[PDB]
Write an enzyme that holds these catalytic residues in place. Structure first.
Site, PDB file in Angstrom:
ATOM      1  N   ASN A  32      -7.297  34.751  31.934  1.00 40.50           N
ATOM      2  CA  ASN A  32      -6.055  34.076  32.134  1.00 40.50           C
ATOM      3  C   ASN A  32      -5.269  33.869  33.045  1.00 40.50           C
ATOM      4  N   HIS A  55      -5.399  41.642  32.032  1.00 34.55           N
ATOM      5  CA  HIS A  55      -6.257  40.954  30.822  1.00 34.55           C
ATOM      6  C   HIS A  55      -7.049  41.706  29.912  1.00 34.55           C
ATOM      7  N   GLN A 113     -17.984  35.944  36.508  1.00 39.99           N
ATOM      8  CA  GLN A 113     -17.068  34.916  35.911  1.00 39.99           C
ATOM      9  C   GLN A 113     -17.828  33.955  34.839  1.00 39.99           C
ATOM     10  N   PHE A 153     -15.131  36.757  31.628  1.00 44.22           N
ATOM     11  CA  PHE A 153     -15.346  37.164  32.802  1.00 44.22           C
ATOM     12  C   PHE A 153     -16.133  38.834  32.212  1.00 44.22           C
ATOM     13  N   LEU A 166      -6.841  44.115  37.586  1.00 43.52           N
ATOM     14  CA  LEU A 166      -6.344  43.003  36.332  1.00 43.52           C
ATOM     15  C   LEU A 166      -6.294  43.751  35.041  1.00 43.52           C
ATOM     16  N   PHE A 212     -17.460  43.034  42.517  1.00 44.57           N
ATOM     17  CA  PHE A 212     -16.099  43.230  41.531  1.00 44.57           C
ATOM     18  C   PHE A 212     -16.266  42.264  39.996  1.00 44.57           C
ATOM     19  N   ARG A 267     -17.274  32.047  38.713  1.00 46.20           N
ATOM     20  CA  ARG A 267     -17.220  32.749  39.752  1.00 46.20           C
ATOM     21  C   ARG A 267     -17.820  33.656  39.599  1.00 46.20           C
TER      22      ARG A 267
END
Lengths: 70, 55, 34, 205, 158, 249, 320, 287
Positions: E94, E118, E55, E105, E114, E52, E47
């Site tokens: 998760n 996270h 990952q 990430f 997050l 931002f 990702r």
């Protein structure tokens, strides 16, 4: 041929002159008359970059770059 | 894309003769690095023809 | 942008290909020959 | 340097120096900016400076600029260098075997002939028109989702019908428009031998 | 067994992450033993959210793979004061809590959302200009970037 | 400046457009259009202009040149670097491209970039004078480690005895005499028996004459003469003059 | 260096046919080896018996120089191509033109046939190539993208199927069905006028005044140079046995080994009696189908036929 | 095409939509060339619409091929562009425009049919300005017919079947009357767009104070479901906060900040819309 076309190299300019001097005095007199329009590629030049290619960018900082005027 | 008929036979022969010349040497046996004077080798070619015709 | 103009010469003609037959010289006999 | 783990309480590092060799202090209640980190920066036009899978400066990107992964773009010296081959019995020196060849023949023939026959029917122009094919039923999933539009349904199933062309109808549009030719392709790289300037003697010869 | 800065010398350039076992001992042990295991070789960045998040870390490379040192997954080691407030936040994400696996990430900017979903576990003490370069690159519609970027060498700190 | 000027612009623009419409080959019209634009200071216009001209003929060194010259005179230095790398990507075997790239990089100071572009450049093993300017660049800095790395690479892509010689030249001047000895050893054992000949050896004897080791000067001299192909005749007279030298001095 | 090249015997002139009235510009051999066909710049297409060299027949349809001829393996057809911008399809059972492919915009410099399907490729001076459907005379594809006369074109069944060398000095390999350029090879410095494909080796060579180059299919990777022939190169033609004939434009024709790149013979024929010496030059070469005879078509209006020398051996002709 | 591109308003209401297709039906007033024309039955006795721009002419600016407004927000294209701060260089003159359209279709041919081309993605930061100017419900007055000029003079003798809404015709003195379709597409002086500019300029936004040392921010209308840590989590990673006074005797708050621009970010983005647990707070700079 050659030298004739040299003669109208000026006497053409007198025409835009006599168009300029009349029309600048004309339209400033209080009349904004236009000759008329149908010019199919004439304005491609004063208006837009005629057929445009944007310079391709590579590996460097181009956005904040800009230029001063005349 | 118009055909070559009967009135363009001589004109066409010369289009293609002088094209062939310009391909042939004045751009494939140069080494006149500058700007290969092809416009003048073609002038020779036309005067060589006039001189052949006049003997 | 496909026009509707047309031509006398593009009328259908010679619409079958003559294939080279057995006796003339087919690519088979060319496969063989010495 | 950065205070120890368990001893990093109390200070908030604001200049990237207090990162030492780097690092964010997640338990320190600040946005951590060690080594240019954190900041969304000016959107500048330099395209992604990639690096090869050996750590080099892959200018193959600048070559293949704005081009798909299909294009072979020779710009490496390892292409200039003469390979050597001595085996008339290598795999390298062997053509595809006729099975692939008959496959590619059939595919070529097919696509060819379809495009042929469309361009040929162009020289029909009197189309002995075939009628309008069966109706289209298509399911459309809008990207606009929301209870208020389509009065609350997440899909619309749509009937396309082909509107009659009037037979006695002349052409509709001025086809013959002239413009210059579009810009070509990404220029290839000139993979030339070292070129020699001639003596002035030679030049005069 | 807490490898202080774990090296993932990726294809475009190196990375090294310091994980605070005092803040996140369990996923710290996960990442230490995992990088030492080297099963990460061939992970494509699963990702890319430009500026931002970055990952990756999945033996699948689709988003539905990845397993931990403990089975499939383990719980989070959640922190009071550790946030994703800035780039280089290394936290395994998760799709539902207590399900943290192999995918990792690496943030690119303030990601305070997050946080609480996270466990922020540490930071990339090396390779952050490279992280900005990576978070610049062009990705397809599915965040597996048009560039097939993988790590060259995955290993701990000694 | 409202409309007399503006219509003068309109005219000259329409002219240049029609001239390039007629030919759109030979480029003087493309250039003059563009430089007229740059003098009126509309570099967006001039930019598109040079891209179009480059399209019609991307093999024009003068086109690439004056394009980048515009960019440099107007210091869109990022833009200029993109231009230069695209150039040296498509027309690599042109040298002045590489040159102007470096020179501008130097007065920019990014000498790390200059080094790597020279690494690029040398991937093509360009040219002796190219290497030599590389080395003068490196010795505008201390970087003698670099310089001998480059003499290493240069003499070993190019088997020249005088290349060997210039390597030891720099060793002598920047005062690395032990390295000069190693390089004379390496050189003579690579060149060696067959096509190795006088002049590397006269240079060796001369350096050891600087060392004033006369007995080993003698032994190297006659031993090389005898071990390798000996002599030819005018060079042998040169060997006689150098012999008087080595014996006396 | 390289292994040692095979020793090939030499070739010796053995016949010289004279019947044309202008440069002879293209030559081709029947499938079944009874006759070859020449097309010349006196605008005729002559058909000669290959045993005796007697002229069986001469066809006159064109309006100018015939610049290429070819004969179909699959159908009783000859395809001619000229400088009058026209491409003709002679049917050989009436000896008559039956089909004509219209649409180029300047002389058609060369022409080739697909061996499996019935399509035609022609290259011309308007800097494009075209793919015609043999049977409905329609242009299915216009391979554009060069920027000068497209001097030559060859087609094959493997992939890529179409290779065009041009006068802007580059080569392009084209995808046929897609109809666009896959690979662009810019290694030559002067115009490329001859390219050839090996019969059994997925390889092809491309000649120019600089030097011949060998390359590897399908992505066009360099293999080796071949140098020595420094003259404008009009033809390349490769045997089955690794013989590679390169015939040039100042008369000289060199013979090489396809594999190692070693030029083993150099022929310099003499011009027909009344010719100038600057009227020596070779425009077409062709191996017969037995690959025993080699015909050449010359700028002095002759067809020179060379044969294999039967009484030479490696000790008569040492290999260097 | 596969199907049109238009908003829900233009798109319809009934679950089963009926539209007829004609290949090469008419000329995109943008691409200038033939397009496909799909004609959709909008609503009960509501004017049948038709696709009115080339699909490439659409994917260019990412707007509605019938409704003409953007597909994400749905405001005039001038507006939406400016709300992304977007600045497109689309050429205008005849030859210039034709060349532009040709290369544009060439460049769009290399697309996958999912999203508009170019800056249309690198301007995808849809600003709350655009979000707030965005209409909420389907303004389905669009599919009502014209002014039945007969029925404006009296004449519409067809009974109720006047092809057009037999109402009072709008006084064309209104700037909201004559907006040339080409100009509306080019973002060229759309008076409705200037109206949206005046509206989004007069629409309430948070105000700035005078002195930089006023770093206390009063949030009015708190209520007793809020926490100090919740006011924090509203304004905490948006910068650093220095202190917070949650006035329960007046139902407000006050964030003293550690970064002025951080305070500005949190508060100005929070103006009347910082809705955590549903309470309309007012972000201002305190006394």
């Amino acid at each position: 041929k050659a030298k004739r076309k040299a003669r109208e190299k000026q006497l053409e300019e007198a025409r835009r002159l006599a168009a300029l001097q009349k029309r600048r005095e004309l339209r400033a007199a209080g009349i904004e008359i236009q000759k008329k329009r149908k010019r199919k590629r004439g304005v491609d030049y004063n208006a837009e970059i005629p057929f445009e290619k944007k310079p391709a960018l590579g590996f460097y900082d181009t956005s904040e770059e800009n230029y001063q005027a005349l | 894309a118009k055909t070559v008929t009967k009135q363009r036979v001589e004109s066409h022969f010369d289009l293609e003769l002088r094209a062939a010349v310009m391909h042939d040497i004045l751009d494939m046996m140069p080494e006149g690095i500058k700007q290969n004077k092809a416009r003048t080798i073609l002038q020779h070619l036309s005067e060589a023809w006039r001189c052949w015709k006049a003997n | 942008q496909l026009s509707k103009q047309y031509s006398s010469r593009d009328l259908p003609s010679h619409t079958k290909i003559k294939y080279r037959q057995t006796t003339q010289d087919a690519p088979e006999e060319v496969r063989n020959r010495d | 340097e950065p205070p120890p783990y368990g001893y990093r309480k109390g200070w908030i590092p604001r200049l990237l120096e207090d990162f030492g060799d780097g690092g964010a202090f997640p338990e320190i209640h600040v946005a951590q900016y060690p080594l240019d980190m954190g900041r969304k920066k000016k959107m500048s036009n330099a395209l992604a400076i990639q690096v090869d899978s050996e750590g080099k400066i892959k200018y193959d990107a600048i070559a293949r600029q704005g081009q798909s992964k299909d294009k072979v773009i020779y710009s490496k010296y390892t292409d200039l260098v003469p390979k050597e081959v001595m085996n008339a019995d290598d795999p390298d020196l062997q053509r595809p075997d006729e099975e692939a060849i008959k496959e590619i023949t059939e595919k070529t023939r097919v696509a060819l002939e379809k495009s042929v026959s469309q361009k040929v029917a162009a020289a029909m122009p009197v189309r002995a028109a075939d009628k309008l094919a069966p109706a289209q039923y298509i399911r459309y999933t809008p990207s606009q989702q929301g209870v208020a539009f389509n009065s609350g349904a997440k899909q619309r199933v749509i009937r396309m019908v082909e509107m009659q062309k009037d037979p006695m109808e002349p052409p509709r549009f001025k086809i013959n428009k002239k413009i210059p030719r579009g810009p070509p392709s990404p220029p290839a790289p000139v993979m030339h031998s070292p070129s020699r300037k001639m003596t002035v003697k030679e030049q005069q010869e | 067994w807490q490898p202080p800065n774990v090296y993932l010398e990726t294809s475009m350039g190196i990375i090294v992450l310091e994980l605070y076992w005092k803040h996140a001992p369990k996923t710290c042990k996960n990442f230490a033993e995992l990088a030492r295991r080297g099963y990460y070789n061939g992970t494509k960045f699963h990702r890319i959210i430009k500026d931002f998040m970055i990952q990756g870390g999945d033996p699948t490379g689709t988003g539905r793979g990845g397993a931990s040192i403990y089975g499939k997954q383990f719980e989070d080691e959640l922190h009071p004061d550790l946030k994703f407030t800035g780039a280089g936040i290394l936290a395994m994400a998760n799709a539902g809590p207590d399900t943290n696996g192999s995918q990792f990430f690496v943030t690119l900017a303030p990601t305070q959302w997050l946080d609480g979903k996270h466990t922020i576990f540490g930071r990339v003490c090396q390779g952050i200009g490279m992280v900005n370069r990576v978070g610049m690159v062009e990705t397809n519609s599915q965040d597996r970037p048009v560039d097939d970027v993988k790590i060259i060498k995955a290993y701990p700190s000694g | 400046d409202e409309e007399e000027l503006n219509d003068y612009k309109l005219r000259k623009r329409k002219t240049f457009e029609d001239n390039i419409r007629k030919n759109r080959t030979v480029i003087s019209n493309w250039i003059k259009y563009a430089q007229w634009e740059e003098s009126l200071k509309e570099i967006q216009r001039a930019r598109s202009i040079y891209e179009r001209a480059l399209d019609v003929d991307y093999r024009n060194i003068t086109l690439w040149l004056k394009y980048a010259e515009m960019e440099m005179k107007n210091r869109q230095v990022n833009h200029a670097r993109n231009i230069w790398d695209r150039a040296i990507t498509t027309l690599p075997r042109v040298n002045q491209f590489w040159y102007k790239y470096t020179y501008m990089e130097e007065m920019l100071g990014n000498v790390a970039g200059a080094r790597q572009v020279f690494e690029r450049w040398m991937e093509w093993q360009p040219e002796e004078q190219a290497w030599h300017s590389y080395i003068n660049f490196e010795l505008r800095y201390k970087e003698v480690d670099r310089a001998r790395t480059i003499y290493e690479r240069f003499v070993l892509v190019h088997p020249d005895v005088k290349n060997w010689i210039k390597y030891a030249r720099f060793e002598e001047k920047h005062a690395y005499f032990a390295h000069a000895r190693k390089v004379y050893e390496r050189a003579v054992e690579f060149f060696g028996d067959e096509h190795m000949d006088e002049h590397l050896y006269v240079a060796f004897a001369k350096f050891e004459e600087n060392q004033k080791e006369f007995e080993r000067v003698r032994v190297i001299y006659k031993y090389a003469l005898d071990r390798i192909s000996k002599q030819e005749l005018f060079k042998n007279y040169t060997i006689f003059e150098k012999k008087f030298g080595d014996r006396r001095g | 260096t390289m292994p040692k090249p095979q020793w090939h015997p030499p070739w010796k002139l053995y016949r010289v046919i004279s019947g044309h009235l202008g440069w002879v510009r293209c030559i081709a051999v029947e499938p079944g080896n009874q006759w070859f066909v020449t097309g010349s710049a006196d605008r005729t297409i002559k058909i000669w018996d290959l045993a005796s060299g007697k002229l069986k027949l001469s066809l006159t349809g064109h309006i100018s120089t015939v610049r290429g001829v070819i004969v179909s393996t699959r159908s009783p057809y000859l395809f001619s191509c000229g400088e009058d911008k026209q491409v003709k399809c002679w049917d050989l059972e009436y000896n008559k033109v039956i089909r004509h492919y219209h649409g180029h915009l300047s002389a058609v410099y060369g022409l080739d046939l697909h061996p499996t399907i019935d399509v035609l490729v022609t290259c011309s001076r308007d800097s494009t190539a075209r793919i015609w459907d043999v049977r409905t005379k329609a242009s299915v594809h216009t391979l554009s993208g060069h920027t000068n006369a497209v001097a030559t074109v060859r087609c094959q069944a493997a992939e890529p199927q179409i290779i065009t060398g041009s006068h802007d000095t580059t080569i392009r390999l084209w995808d046929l069905v897609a109809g666009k350029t896959r690979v662009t090879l810019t290694n030559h410095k002067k115009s490329v006028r001859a390219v050839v494909l090996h019969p059994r080796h997925y390889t092809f060579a491309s000649g120019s005044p600089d030097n011949i180059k060998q390359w590897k299919f399908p992505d066009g990777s360099f293999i080796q140079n071949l140098s020595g022939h420094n003259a404008i190169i009009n033809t390349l033609t490769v045997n089955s046995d690794g013989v590679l004939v390169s015939g040039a434009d100042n008369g000289t024709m060199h013979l090489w080994d396809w594999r190692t790149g070693y030029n083993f013979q150099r022929v310099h024929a003499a011009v027909q009696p009344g010719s100038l010496d600057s009227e020596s030059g070779i425009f077409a070469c062709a191996f017969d189908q037995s690959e025993s005879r080699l015909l050449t078509a010359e700028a002095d209006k002759t067809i020179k036929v060379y044969r294999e020398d039967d009484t030479a051996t490696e000790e008569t002709h040492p290999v260097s | 095409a596969d199907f049109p591109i238009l908003c829900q308003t233009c798109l319809g209401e009934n679950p089963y939509i009926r539209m007829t297709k004609e290949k090469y039906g008419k000329e995109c007033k943008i691409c200038a060339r033939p397009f496909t024309v799909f004609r959709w039955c909008p609503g009960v006795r509501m004017r049948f619409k038709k696709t009115e721009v080339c699909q490439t002419c659409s994917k260019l600016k990412n707007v509605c091929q019938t409704c003409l407004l953007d597909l994400e927000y749905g405001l005039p294209i001038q507006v939406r562009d400016a709300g992304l701060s977007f600045k497109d260089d689309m050429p205008k003159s005849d030859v210039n425009k034709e060349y532009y359209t040709q290369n544009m279709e060439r460049e769009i041919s290399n697309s996958d049919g999912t999203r508009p081309v170019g800056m249309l993605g690198k301007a995808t930061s849809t600003s709350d300005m655009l979000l707030k100017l965005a209409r909420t419900t389907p303004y389905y007055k669009r599919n009502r017919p014209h002014i039945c000029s007969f029925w404006v003079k009296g004449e519409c003798k067809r009974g109720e079947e006047c092809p057009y809404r037999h109402e009072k015709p709008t006084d064309p003195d209104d700037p909201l009357a004559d907006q040339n379709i080409k100009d509306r597409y080019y973002g060229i002086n759309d008076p409705v767009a200037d109206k949206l500019l005046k509206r989004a300029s007069t629409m309430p936004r948070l105000d700035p104070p005078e002195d930089k040392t006023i770093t206390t921010l009063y949030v009015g209308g708190l209520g007793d479901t809020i926490t100090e840590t919740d006011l924090r989590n509203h304004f905490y990673q948006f910068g650093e906060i220095r202190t917070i006074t949650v006035v329960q005797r007046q139902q407000c708050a006050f964030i003293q900040f550690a970064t002025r621009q951080a305070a500005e970010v949190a508060a100005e983005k929070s103006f009347n819309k910082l809705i955590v647990n549903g309470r309309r707070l007012n972000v201002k700079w305190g006394r």
